[PDB]
Structures are given as structure tokens and as C-alpha cells.
């Protein structure tokens, strides 16, 4: 009997806010400022060498 089960059709989509995006988030937080910050300073500059540059 369990094998005979089926699945209902779910809703197509929920509400899509016309003024919020992943790159331009509507509300503010320090998390998004952190993403923009580490994109500016770039990722950790990992050295492949065995001795320091200086």
C-alpha cells in the first residue's frame, strides 16, 4: 500500500521582493560589509616559499 503513494503538486513560487537582491540587500548588517571588505583586500596572500620575503 505504501508503494502506491503519490505526491501532490506544490506551489510554483512564494513572494519575490522587487527591491531585495543578494548583491544589493535591502536591510543592513555587518555580514555584507564583511563580504565587500574581504573582496577589497582580497583573500589571504598565501606564500608558497620556504622563507619569508623580508
Amino acid at each position: 500500500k505504501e508503494n502506491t503513494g503519490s505526491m501532490k503538486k506544490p506551489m510554483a513560487k512564494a513572494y519575490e521582493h522587487p527591491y531585495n537582491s543578494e548583491h544589493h540587500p535591502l536591510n543592513f548588517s555587518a555580514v555584507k560589509i564583511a563580504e565587500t571588505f574581504h573582496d577589497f583586500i582580497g583573500p589571504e596572500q598565501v606564500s608558497p616559499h620556504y622563507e619569508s620575503f623580508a
Binding site: 577589497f40 583586500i41 582580497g42 589571504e44 596572500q45 616559499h49 622563507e51 620575503f53
Partner: peptide, 25 residues
């Protein structure tokens, strides 16, 4: 020979993004 031209390379990275080079160093 792996350390060849290492001074030039760090100079160009400082010019490309000085704030990132200074920040991580």
C-alpha cells in the same frame, strides 16, 4: 631558482592592490 624575480613580483602585487598587500602582510 624558485626565489628568482621575487622582489619584482611583490612590487607588482603592491601596485595591483596596495591595501590588500599591506593588510595581510
Amino acid at each position: 631558482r624558485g626565489n628568482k624575480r621575487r622582489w619584482f613580483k611583490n612590487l607588482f602585487r603592491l601596485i595591483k592592490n596596495p591595501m590588500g598587500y599591506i593588510f595581510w602582510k
